Amino acid sequence: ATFEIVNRCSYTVWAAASKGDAALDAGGRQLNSGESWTINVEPGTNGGKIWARTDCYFDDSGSGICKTGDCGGLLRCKRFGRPPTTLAEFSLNQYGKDYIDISNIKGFNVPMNFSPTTRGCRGVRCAADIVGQCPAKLKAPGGGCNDACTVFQTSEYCCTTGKCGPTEYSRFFKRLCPDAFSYVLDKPTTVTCPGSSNYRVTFCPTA
Ligand SMILES: O=C1O[C@H]([C@@H](O)CO)C(O)=C1O
Ligand SMILES: O=C1O[C@H]([C@@H](O)CO)C(O)=C1O
Ligand SMILES: O=C1O[C@H]([C@@H](O)CO)C(O)=C1O
Ligand SMILES: O=C1O[C@H]([C@@H](O)CO)C(O)=C1O
Ligand SMILES: O=C1O[C@H]([C@@H](O)CO)C(O)=C1O
Ligand code: NA
Ligand code: NA
Ligand code: NA
Ligand code: NA
Ligand code: NA
Ligand code: NA
Ligand code: NA
Ligand code: NA
């Protein structure tokens, strides 16, 4: 599957793509404002994520740090990124269908649109100004708006028992972005697409 990753932000981002225990395609790349990076994701990839990272520094070996979404210090990510991260999530070729969503379960750093470029389903979007509106106790100094699980590490926020409800904090993310997961047991906002669809992830879509 083809994913075109487009940075419409005014600022540089470092895109990342992983399934948790491996890179997808090269795993990461710099995108200056306006740049597009096209990757290939293997069919059948389960549990893939794409995200942006902000305020990164890398040396010539591709090691360094980002203020949001750092993945073990690597330019090419192999693992998931440090919150806060707005997440484009996908599982491809699962019994004939693809499943896409946007999540704020790991917080929010950059606004996002995640849409198919082929026919048969609709896209999803979280483009509200979550960072500017973020509750004081969730604000990350690095940039971004942390989820409550990251901040407080409770069973209720992290839904560790598989028993949890919405919270004051999850409802904030839900109010600003109804079409994204706000907590682990949120009513799903997953979209079912035809198997082997292709996609575009746009950072800062309203920019
Ligand atoms: O880091 C980058 O890589 C590409 C190009 O320079 C070679 O792939 C690009 O446009 C970036 O900002
Ligand atoms: O116009 C500009 O381009 C770069 C950056 O935004 C590219 O992403 C920068 O720092 C500017 O002031
Ligand atoms: O893969 C996972 O992603 C979400 C969350 O961590 C980010 O949305 C979750 O609950 C998983 O088990
Ligand atoms: O495995 C996942 O779990 C959550 C959600 O679907 C249920 O918590 C999510 O965002 C994932 O990628
Ligand atoms: O039937 C198919 O659709 C996709 C692609 O063509 C996008 O539509 C693909 O890889 C197929 O085999
Ligand atoms: Na891949
Ligand atoms: Na295939
Ligand atoms: Na992101
Ligand atoms: Na990183
Ligand atoms: Na507030
Ligand atoms: Na199909
Ligand atoms: Na298909
Ligand atoms: Na936007």
Curated annotation (Swiss-Prot):
Claim: Disulfide bond is one of the keywords in the record: yes
Localization, UniProt: Cytoplasmic vesicle
This protein's GO CC annotations: cytoplasmic vesicle
Family annotation (SMART domains): THN (SM00205)
This protein's UniProt keywords: Cytoplasmic vesicle, Disulfide bond, Signal, Taste-modifying protein
Disulfide-bonded cysteines: 9-204, 56-66, 71-77, 121-193, 126-177, 134-145, 149-158, 159-164
Gene3D superfamilies: Thaumatin
Stored PROSITE patterns: THAUMATIN_1 (PS00316), THAUMATIN_2 (PS51367)
InterPro entries: Osmotin/thaumatin-like_sf (IPR037176), Thaumatin (IPR001938), Thaumatin_CS (IPR017949)
Its job: Taste-modifying protein; intensely sweet-tasting. It is 100000 times sweeter than sucrose on a molar basis.
Family as reported in the entry's similarity comment: Belongs to the thaumatin family.
Protein's UniProt name: Thaumatin I
Organism in which the protein naturally occurs: Thaumatococcus daniellii (Katemfe)
